[PDB]
Each structure stands twice: as structure tokens, then as C-alpha cells.
Amino acid sequence: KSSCKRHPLYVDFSDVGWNDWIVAPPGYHAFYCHGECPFPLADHLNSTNHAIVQTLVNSVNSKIPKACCVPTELSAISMLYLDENEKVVLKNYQDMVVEGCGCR
Amino acid sequence: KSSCKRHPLYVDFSDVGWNDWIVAPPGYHAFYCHGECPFPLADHLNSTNHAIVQTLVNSVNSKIPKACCVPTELSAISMLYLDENEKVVLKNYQDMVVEGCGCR
Amino acid sequence: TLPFLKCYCSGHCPDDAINNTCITNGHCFAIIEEDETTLASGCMKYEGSDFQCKDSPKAQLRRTIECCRTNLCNQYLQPTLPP
Amino acid sequence: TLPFLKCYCSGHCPDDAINNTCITNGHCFAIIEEDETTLASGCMKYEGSDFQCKDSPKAQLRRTIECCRTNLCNQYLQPTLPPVVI
């Protein structure tokens, strides 16, 4: 429907069934990117030159796909899980949270 | 059909109609990324943790989209164009060539 | 390369826009398309703007885009479809 | 974090694979899916592997994935699908 943008997505470790090995947190806000990359690509869609050129090419011939709405900025989060040893470990997972979206 | 991968795409500045302001080169290989991001995401699809998690969530509920095949590495190129002043200028455009693809 | 231009946006406004305006370091643009005909405007980042403001004479759908670099030069712009 | 593991790949081979093998710094995997049933294998990067090797018990389609960290441990692995729900 609309343009590329960030959408809310909460991952509850129980719904997916990971609460058996992940002790904390019980869930977290991951978010996700989605939406069209039209012409022209506006400032806030923070896109690369290639995405620009690809979008124009698609305008000349639709056999070539449009740019894609994907994460452009991501933050990490910390989790407490149980390794095979049955011991609680603290790990810091990178790129777990979508901070911003864009057309690539 | 197949998985995420780089595809060939040559941009001829005459076909798009830019040969009036771009003196050199006459065209260039831009390439483009395309293809599915299935589960699991293999090593060569070089994806982020978020992409991984998003792909699993999509397996539990298809309302959430799959990761997208987009450029992950890009190189620049130099071009010689005419600015409004009718003067030939040399500019180096970043992220013009898709060097590699991945699932984001 | 810090945003300094204030533009009027319509159809291409970022989610945090205020009173239909966006800020940018590139250009303000207005565009008409067809297939019916609509008018939109917004902010265009500087990098890659020469590609977008030129557009391609060989696009499948007829449309005209115009760019300017003056605060709210967007506001009143009526590009005209190509003959 | 330099690739050191050699795996057998099938269906998930990178374009530059040699004799159906890939190299990685993570795990080798084999997986069976349905909807009909198929078997695939490949290399899995280390980062994010704990998520993928665990998989989710609540995926819509039945499938089983297995991971290992020994050269060509892929080769001969026959995961067994989850019993149909009744």
C-alpha cells in the first residue's frame, strides 16, 4: 500500500517456543521494514546511488526489479540463555533491532 | 525460482537517454540482487541476526515477510558529465556497482 | 551536508514531518504522473539527485519532475506532462 | 573467525562451490522439509547459528534441521521429520 517504512514486530520467545533455552528477556521489539520504493526515492528512504539507478531502470523496463525496503540501521540486545552445559550465559546479540529502514 | 544472488545488469546511458549529459563512460555493469531468502539462511547469503530471526518468525506466521535480497557490498565508478555550465566535470559516484548480495 | 533546505511535501512526506514539510540537504521536488494523473512533492537527498532530477526520457509512464533549492520552492510548482 | 570447516552442500551451495562442498566458520547442516518432501544441506555462518540450528517448534511446515562441526559431517545425515499432528 504505502512506502517503505518501519513496522512494529514484537517477538515473544514463548510464541516461537524458545523460552526453554532463553531465560531473559521474555521477548523484545524487533520491528521490520516493508513497503514500496517508488520514483523518486525521497530523502528519508536513505538509499544508495545503485538503488536510485536501479529504480530508474525499472521505469524504463519493468523486467528489472525495484529497490527493496530493508533495515539500514540496527542495534544490539543482551540475552540470558542456557548452553548445552545447563549453565546460564550472558550474550550480546548484534543487529537484533531494526532502528531504521531504507531502499536498497 | 532460485535463491538470493547477484544478476547481470548493464546500464547503457543511451538506452536510458543520458548520453546527452554523460560523456563517459558510454555505459557500465551495475548488476542487481534478486532471489529468495529461505530457511535456513546459508553462509554465503551473509545475513544479519535480525534477518535470521525475521525468517524464523515468517515460518511460524506468514503475515511477517521474509528477508530481502539486496546489495551488501558496492564499489564506486568515475564518470565525466556536463554540468549546466556546459563544462565537462569528473565525478566519482559511490555505491554504483553491486559487488555482493545478501539477505536483509 | 547538514540539512538546511525546507521543502513542502505531499505523498512523499517522512513520518515525522511537520505541517507537510520536510528538511533536506538536497532539493525540493514536485512531480506529476499518469495511469489517473496525480501530483506529489517532497525532499530529495543530495546524493543521487542528479539522476532523479534528470529522470529518464524513456520511462514507460509519462511524468515530469522538477527540482529547486530554495526554501518551500516546492509549494507552488505545476510540472506539465510531456506531449 | 576465519573459515576452517568444510561441508557438503546440496541445494544451498554458493555459486563458487567445488564438488558440492562449501567452507565456513560455523556449522554444517542437513534439513528435510515438506510440501513434496526434500533433503538439503550446506554451510551455516557462525553468527545466528544458534537460532537456525534450534529452529522453532512452531513452524507451519514440518521439517528437521541438524548441525555439526566436523569436516563433511554433512555428507551422511538423515534427519527425520516431526510426527504428523493428530
Side-chain angles (χ1 to χ4, degrees), chain C residues 14-43:
Chain C
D15 285 309
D16 66 8
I18 293 299
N19 312 323
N20 298 292
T21 61
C22 48
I23 63 180
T24 184
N25 76 335
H27 310 255
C28 293
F29 73 82
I31 181 185
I32 41 173
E33 306 180 293
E34 185 173 67
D35 190 60
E36 180 196 63
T37 76
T38 68
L39 212 183
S41 51
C43 291

PDB file of all heavy atoms in Angstrom, chain C residues 14-43:
ATOM      1  N   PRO C  14       8.016  12.328   5.174  1.00  0.00           N
ATOM      2  CA  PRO C  14       8.557  11.321   6.085  1.00  0.00           C
ATOM      3  C   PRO C  14       7.557  11.255   7.236  1.00  0.00           C
ATOM      4  O   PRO C  14       6.763  12.181   7.412  1.00  0.00           O
ATOM      5  CB  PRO C  14       9.900  11.916   6.488  1.00  0.00           C
ATOM      6  CG  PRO C  14       9.637  13.376   6.439  1.00  0.00           C
ATOM      7  CD  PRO C  14       8.860  13.533   5.162  1.00  0.00           C
ATOM      8  N   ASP C  15       7.575  10.181   8.017  1.00  0.00           N
ATOM      9  CA  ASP C  15       6.615  10.063   9.111  1.00  0.00           C
ATOM     10  C   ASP C  15       6.668  11.153  10.170  1.00  0.00           C
ATOM     11  O   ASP C  15       5.664  11.434  10.816  1.00  0.00           O
ATOM     12  CB  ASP C  15       6.742   8.701   9.785  1.00  0.00           C
ATOM     13  CG  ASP C  15       6.146   7.584   8.944  1.00  0.00           C
ATOM     14  OD1 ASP C  15       4.978   7.728   8.509  1.00  0.00           O
ATOM     15  OD2 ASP C  15       6.839   6.564   8.722  1.00  0.00           O
ATOM     16  N   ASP C  16       7.828  11.774  10.342  1.00  0.00           N
ATOM     17  CA  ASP C  16       7.990  12.821  11.338  1.00  0.00           C
ATOM     18  C   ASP C  16       7.875  14.225  10.751  1.00  0.00           C
ATOM     19  O   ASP C  16       8.441  15.178  11.285  1.00  0.00           O
ATOM     20  CB  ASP C  16       9.348  12.663  12.028  1.00  0.00           C
ATOM     21  CG  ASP C  16      10.521  12.905  11.083  1.00  0.00           C
ATOM     22  OD1 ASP C  16      10.304  13.342   9.929  1.00  0.00           O
ATOM     23  OD2 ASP C  16      11.672  12.662  11.506  1.00  0.00           O
ATOM     24  N   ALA C  17       7.151  14.364   9.652  1.00  0.00           N
ATOM     25  CA  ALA C  17       7.011  15.678   9.041  1.00  0.00           C
ATOM     26  C   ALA C  17       6.130  16.580   9.900  1.00  0.00           C
ATOM     27  O   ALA C  17       5.349  16.102  10.720  1.00  0.00           O
ATOM     28  CB  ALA C  17       6.430  15.552   7.636  1.00  0.00           C
ATOM     29  N   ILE C  18       6.271  17.887   9.703  1.00  0.00           N
ATOM     30  CA  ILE C  18       5.503  18.877  10.445  1.00  0.00           C
ATOM     31  C   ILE C  18       4.804  19.826   9.480  1.00  0.00           C
ATOM     32  O   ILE C  18       5.448  20.535   8.710  1.00  0.00           O
ATOM     33  CB  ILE C  18       6.419  19.702  11.399  1.00  0.00           C
ATOM     34  CG1 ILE C  18       6.968  18.801  12.510  1.00  0.00           C
ATOM     35  CG2 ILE C  18       5.639  20.850  12.021  1.00  0.00           C
ATOM     36  CD1 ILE C  18       5.889  18.181  13.391  1.00  0.00           C
ATOM     37  N   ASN C  19       3.478  19.831   9.530  1.00  0.00           N
ATOM     38  CA  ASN C  19       2.673  20.689   8.665  1.00  0.00           C
ATOM     39  C   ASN C  19       3.057  20.531   7.201  1.00  0.00           C
ATOM     40  O   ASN C  19       3.214  21.522   6.487  1.00  0.00           O
ATOM     41  CB  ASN C  19       2.823  22.163   9.056  1.00  0.00           C
ATOM     42  CG  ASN C  19       2.668  22.397  10.552  1.00  0.00           C
ATOM     43  OD1 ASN C  19       1.849  21.754  11.222  1.00  0.00           O
ATOM     44  ND2 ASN C  19       3.448  23.337  11.081  1.00  0.00           N
ATOM     45  N   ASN C  20       3.218  19.287   6.763  1.00  0.00           N
ATOM     46  CA  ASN C  20       3.566  18.992   5.380  1.00  0.00           C
ATOM     47  C   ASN C  20       4.855  19.619   4.904  1.00  0.00           C
ATOM     48  O   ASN C  20       4.899  20.253   3.853  1.00  0.00           O
ATOM     49  CB  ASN C  20       2.432  19.416   4.456  1.00  0.00           C
ATOM     50  CG  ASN C  20       1.155  18.664   4.739  1.00  0.00           C
ATOM     51  OD1 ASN C  20       1.068  17.456   4.505  1.00  0.00           O
ATOM     52  ND2 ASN C  20       0.154  19.370   5.261  1.00  0.00           N
ATOM     53  N   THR C  21       5.907  19.452   5.686  1.00  0.00           N
ATOM     54  CA  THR C  21       7.202  19.967   5.296  1.00  0.00           C
ATOM     55  C   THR C  21       8.248  18.969   5.761  1.00  0.00           C
ATOM     56  O   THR C  21       8.026  18.222   6.715  1.00  0.00           O
ATOM     57  CB  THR C  21       7.500  21.360   5.914  1.00  0.00           C
ATOM     58  OG1 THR C  21       7.503  21.265   7.341  1.00  0.00           O
ATOM     59  CG2 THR C  21       6.469  22.379   5.463  1.00  0.00           C
ATOM     60  N   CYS C  22       9.371  18.942   5.057  1.00  0.00           N
ATOM     61  CA  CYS C  22      10.479  18.053   5.381  1.00  0.00           C
ATOM     62  C   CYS C  22      11.729  18.899   5.231  1.00  0.00           C
ATOM     63  O   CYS C  22      11.694  19.928   4.572  1.00  0.00           O
ATOM     64  CB  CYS C  22      10.527  16.856   4.402  1.00  0.00           C
ATOM     65  SG  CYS C  22      10.384  17.291   2.627  1.00  0.00           S
ATOM     66  N   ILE C  23      12.820  18.493   5.861  1.00  0.00           N
ATOM     67  CA  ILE C  23      14.062  19.233   5.717  1.00  0.00           C
ATOM     68  C   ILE C  23      15.039  18.321   4.957  1.00  0.00           C
ATOM     69  O   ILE C  23      14.916  17.093   4.997  1.00  0.00           O
ATOM     70  CB  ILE C  23      14.643  19.659   7.100  1.00  0.00           C
ATOM     71  CG1 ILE C  23      14.995  18.436   7.941  1.00  0.00           C
ATOM     72  CG2 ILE C  23      13.619  20.490   7.854  1.00  0.00           C
ATOM     73  CD1 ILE C  23      15.566  18.784   9.298  1.00  0.00           C
ATOM     74  N   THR C  24      15.998  18.910   4.253  1.00  0.00           N
ATOM     75  CA  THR C  24      16.938  18.103   3.484  1.00  0.00           C
ATOM     76  C   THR C  24      18.201  18.883   3.151  1.00  0.00           C
ATOM     77  O   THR C  24      18.304  20.069   3.449  1.00  0.00           O
ATOM     78  CB  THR C  24      16.272  17.615   2.164  1.00  0.00           C
ATOM     79  OG1 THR C  24      17.169  16.749   1.455  1.00  0.00           O
ATOM     80  CG2 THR C  24      15.900  18.813   1.276  1.00  0.00           C
ATOM     81  N   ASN C  25      19.167  18.209   2.543  1.00  0.00           N
ATOM     82  CA  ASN C  25      20.407  18.862   2.155  1.00  0.00           C
ATOM     83  C   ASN C  25      20.542  18.804   0.633  1.00  0.00           C
ATOM     84  O   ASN C  25      21.595  19.137   0.076  1.00  0.00           O
ATOM     85  CB  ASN C  25      21.598  18.174   2.828  1.00  0.00           C
ATOM     86  CG  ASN C  25      21.967  16.843   2.176  1.00  0.00           C
ATOM     87  OD1 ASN C  25      21.138  16.174   1.545  1.00  0.00           O
ATOM     88  ND2 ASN C  25      23.219  16.445   2.346  1.00  0.00           N
ATOM     89  N   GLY C  26      19.460  18.389  -0.030  1.00  0.00           N
ATOM     90  CA  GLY C  26      19.462  18.279  -1.477  1.00  0.00           C
ATOM     91  C   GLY C  26      18.541  19.235  -2.216  1.00  0.00           C
ATOM     92  O   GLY C  26      18.853  20.423  -2.390  1.00  0.00           O
ATOM     93  N   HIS C  27      17.396  18.725  -2.659  1.00  0.00           N
ATOM     94  CA  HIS C  27      16.457  19.550  -3.410  1.00  0.00           C
ATOM     95  C   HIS C  27      15.033  19.338  -2.967  1.00  0.00           C
ATOM     96  O   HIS C  27      14.725  18.411  -2.219  1.00  0.00           O
ATOM     97  CB  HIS C  27      16.508  19.209  -4.905  1.00  0.00           C
ATOM     98  CG  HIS C  27      17.886  19.189  -5.483  1.00  0.00           C
ATOM     99  ND1 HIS C  27      18.369  20.195  -6.291  1.00  0.00           N
ATOM    100  CD2 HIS C  27      18.895  18.294  -5.351  1.00  0.00           C
ATOM    101  CE1 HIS C  27      19.617  19.922  -6.629  1.00  0.00           C
ATOM    102  NE2 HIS C  27      19.959  18.773  -6.071  1.00  0.00           N
ATOM    103  N   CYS C  28      14.168  20.215  -3.455  1.00  0.00           N
ATOM    104  CA  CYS C  28      12.744  20.126  -3.200  1.00  0.00           C
ATOM    105  C   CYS C  28      12.251  19.668  -4.567  1.00  0.00           C
ATOM    106  O   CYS C  28      12.805  20.085  -5.588  1.00  0.00           O
ATOM    107  CB  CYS C  28      12.144  21.499  -2.900  1.00  0.00           C
ATOM    108  SG  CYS C  28      12.643  22.333  -1.361  1.00  0.00           S
ATOM    109  N   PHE C  29      11.236  18.815  -4.612  1.00  0.00           N
ATOM    110  CA  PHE C  29      10.740  18.375  -5.906  1.00  0.00           C
ATOM    111  C   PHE C  29       9.225  18.307  -5.970  1.00  0.00           C
ATOM    112  O   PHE C  29       8.536  18.218  -4.947  1.00  0.00           O
ATOM    113  CB  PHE C  29      11.318  16.998  -6.279  1.00  0.00           C
ATOM    114  CG  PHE C  29      10.727  15.847  -5.499  1.00  0.00           C
ATOM    115  CD1 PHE C  29       9.510  15.279  -5.884  1.00  0.00           C
ATOM    116  CD2 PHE C  29      11.374  15.341  -4.374  1.00  0.00           C
ATOM    117  CE1 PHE C  29       8.940  14.219  -5.152  1.00  0.00           C
ATOM    118  CE2 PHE C  29      10.818  14.281  -3.634  1.00  0.00           C
ATOM    119  CZ  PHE C  29       9.598  13.719  -4.024  1.00  0.00           C
ATOM    120  N   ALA C  30       8.719  18.351  -7.198  1.00  0.00           N
ATOM    121  CA  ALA C  30       7.290  18.246  -7.471  1.00  0.00           C
ATOM    122  C   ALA C  30       7.231  17.288  -8.652  1.00  0.00           C
ATOM    123  O   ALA C  30       8.113  17.309  -9.516  1.00  0.00           O
ATOM    124  CB  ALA C  30       6.718  19.602  -7.861  1.00  0.00           C
ATOM    125  N   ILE C  31       6.212  16.444  -8.701  1.00  0.00           N
ATOM    126  CA  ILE C  31       6.114  15.505  -9.807  1.00  0.00           C
ATOM    127  C   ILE C  31       4.678  15.108 -10.145  1.00  0.00           C
ATOM    128  O   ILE C  31       3.841  14.930  -9.253  1.00  0.00           O
ATOM    129  CB  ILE C  31       6.945  14.213  -9.511  1.00  0.00           C
ATOM    130  CG1 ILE C  31       6.853  13.245 -10.695  1.00  0.00           C
ATOM    131  CG2 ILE C  31       6.444  13.535  -8.241  1.00  0.00           C
ATOM    132  CD1 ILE C  31       7.518  11.909 -10.458  1.00  0.00           C
ATOM    133  N   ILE C  32       4.403  14.993 -11.445  1.00  0.00           N
ATOM    134  CA  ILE C  32       3.095  14.565 -11.951  1.00  0.00           C
ATOM    135  C   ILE C  32       3.283  13.251 -12.704  1.00  0.00           C
ATOM    136  O   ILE C  32       4.250  13.080 -13.445  1.00  0.00           O
ATOM    137  CB  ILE C  32       2.489  15.569 -12.943  1.00  0.00           C
ATOM    138  CG1 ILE C  32       3.583  16.088 -13.871  1.00  0.00           C
ATOM    139  CG2 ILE C  32       1.790  16.693 -12.203  1.00  0.00           C
ATOM    140  CD1 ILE C  32       3.053  16.945 -14.976  1.00  0.00           C
ATOM    141  N   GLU C  33       2.351  12.328 -12.527  1.00  0.00           N
ATOM    142  CA  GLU C  33       2.444  11.043 -13.194  1.00  0.00           C
ATOM    143  C   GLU C  33       1.139  10.757 -13.917  1.00  0.00           C
ATOM    144  O   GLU C  33       0.246  11.594 -13.930  1.00  0.00           O
ATOM    145  CB  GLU C  33       2.731   9.957 -12.159  1.00  0.00           C
ATOM    146  CG  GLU C  33       3.956  10.248 -11.301  1.00  0.00           C
ATOM    147  CD  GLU C  33       4.232   9.166 -10.269  1.00  0.00           C
ATOM    148  OE1 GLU C  33       3.417   9.006  -9.331  1.00  0.00           O
ATOM    149  OE2 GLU C  33       5.268   8.473 -10.399  1.00  0.00           O
ATOM    150  N   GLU C  34       1.031   9.581 -14.528  1.00  0.00           N
ATOM    151  CA  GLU C  34      -0.187   9.209 -15.234  1.00  0.00           C
ATOM    152  C   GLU C  34      -0.496   7.716 -15.123  1.00  0.00           C
ATOM    153  O   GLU C  34       0.368   6.916 -14.761  1.00  0.00           O
ATOM    154  CB  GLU C  34      -0.090   9.612 -16.705  1.00  0.00           C
ATOM    155  CG  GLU C  34      -1.381   9.369 -17.464  1.00  0.00           C
ATOM    156  CD  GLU C  34      -1.361   9.927 -18.874  1.00  0.00           C
ATOM    157  OE1 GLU C  34      -0.582   9.420 -19.711  1.00  0.00           O
ATOM    158  OE2 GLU C  34      -2.132  10.875 -19.141  1.00  0.00           O
ATOM    159  N   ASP C  35      -1.740   7.356 -15.436  1.00  0.00           N
ATOM    160  CA  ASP C  35      -2.224   5.975 -15.377  1.00  0.00           C
ATOM    161  C   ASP C  35      -2.118   5.387 -13.969  1.00  0.00           C
ATOM    162  O   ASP C  35      -3.087   5.582 -13.199  1.00  0.00           O
ATOM    163  CB  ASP C  35      -1.455   5.089 -16.364  1.00  0.00           C
ATOM    164  CG  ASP C  35      -2.082   3.710 -16.518  1.00  0.00           C
ATOM    165  OD1 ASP C  35      -3.260   3.635 -16.941  1.00  0.00           O
ATOM    166  OD2 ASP C  35      -1.401   2.705 -16.217  1.00  0.00           O
ATOM    167  N   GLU C  36      -6.283   9.200 -12.330  1.00  0.00           N
ATOM    168  CA  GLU C  36      -5.202   8.748 -13.261  1.00  0.00           C
ATOM    169  C   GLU C  36      -3.907   9.542 -13.070  1.00  0.00           C
ATOM    170  O   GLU C  36      -2.853   8.964 -12.781  1.00  0.00           O
ATOM    171  CB  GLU C  36      -5.658   8.889 -14.708  1.00  0.00           C
ATOM    172  CG  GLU C  36      -4.607   8.458 -15.704  1.00  0.00           C
ATOM    173  CD  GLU C  36      -4.897   8.961 -17.099  1.00  0.00           C
ATOM    174  OE1 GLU C  36      -4.909  10.199 -17.295  1.00  0.00           O
ATOM    175  OE2 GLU C  36      -5.113   8.113 -17.995  1.00  0.00           O
ATOM    176  N   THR C  37      -3.987  10.862 -13.252  1.00  0.00           N
ATOM    177  CA  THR C  37      -2.824  11.733 -13.082  1.00  0.00           C
ATOM    178  C   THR C  37      -2.827  12.288 -11.656  1.00  0.00           C
ATOM    179  O   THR C  37      -3.871  12.695 -11.148  1.00  0.00           O
ATOM    180  CB  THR C  37      -2.847  12.912 -14.069  1.00  0.00           C
ATOM    181  OG1 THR C  37      -3.806  13.879 -13.632  1.00  0.00           O
ATOM    182  CG2 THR C  37      -3.222  12.427 -15.465  1.00  0.00           C
ATOM    183  N   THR C  38      -1.661  12.296 -11.015  1.00  0.00           N
ATOM    184  CA  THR C  38      -1.548  12.779  -9.643  1.00  0.00           C
ATOM    185  C   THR C  38      -0.368  13.737  -9.475  1.00  0.00           C
ATOM    186  O   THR C  38       0.510  13.816 -10.335  1.00  0.00           O
ATOM    187  CB  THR C  38      -1.367  11.604  -8.679  1.00  0.00           C
ATOM    188  OG1 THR C  38      -0.095  10.993  -8.909  1.00  0.00           O
ATOM    189  CG2 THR C  38      -2.440  10.565  -8.915  1.00  0.00           C
ATOM    190  N   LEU C  39      -0.351  14.466  -8.365  1.00  0.00           N
ATOM    191  CA  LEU C  39       0.726  15.405  -8.101  1.00  0.00           C
ATOM    192  C   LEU C  39       1.315  15.126  -6.720  1.00  0.00           C
ATOM    193  O   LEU C  39       0.580  14.944  -5.750  1.00  0.00           O
ATOM    194  CB  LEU C  39       0.197  16.835  -8.163  1.00  0.00           C
ATOM    195  CG  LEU C  39       1.161  17.917  -8.651  1.00  0.00           C
ATOM    196  CD1 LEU C  39       0.464  19.263  -8.556  1.00  0.00           C
ATOM    197  CD2 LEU C  39       2.438  17.931  -7.823  1.00  0.00           C
ATOM    198  N   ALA C  40       2.641  15.073  -6.636  1.00  0.00           N
ATOM    199  CA  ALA C  40       3.305  14.820  -5.365  1.00  0.00           C
ATOM    200  C   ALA C  40       4.544  15.686  -5.242  1.00  0.00           C
ATOM    201  O   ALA C  40       5.026  16.253  -6.226  1.00  0.00           O
ATOM    202  CB  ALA C  40       3.672  13.350  -5.241  1.00  0.00           C
ATOM    203  N   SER C  41       5.058  15.784  -4.024  1.00  0.00           N
ATOM    204  CA  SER C  41       6.226  16.603  -3.760  1.00  0.00           C
ATOM    205  C   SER C  41       6.940  16.070  -2.533  1.00  0.00           C
ATOM    206  O   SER C  41       6.373  15.282  -1.784  1.00  0.00           O
ATOM    207  CB  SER C  41       5.779  18.039  -3.515  1.00  0.00           C
ATOM    208  OG  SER C  41       4.750  18.071  -2.536  1.00  0.00           O
ATOM    209  N   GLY C  42       8.179  16.503  -2.325  1.00  0.00           N
ATOM    210  CA  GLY C  42       8.926  16.048  -1.169  1.00  0.00           C
ATOM    211  C   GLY C  42      10.367  16.515  -1.180  1.00  0.00           C
ATOM    212  O   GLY C  42      10.741  17.386  -1.970  1.00  0.00           O
ATOM    213  N   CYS C  43      11.172  15.930  -0.296  1.00  0.00           N
ATOM    214  CA  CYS C  43      12.589  16.260  -0.181  1.00  0.00           C
ATOM    215  C   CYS C  43      13.431  15.178  -0.831  1.00  0.00           C
ATOM    216  O   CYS C  43      13.123  13.990  -0.738  1.00  0.00           O
ATOM    217  CB  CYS C  43      12.985  16.402   1.294  1.00  0.00           C
ATOM    218  SG  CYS C  43      12.257  17.874   2.072  1.00  0.00           S
TER     219      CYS C  43
END
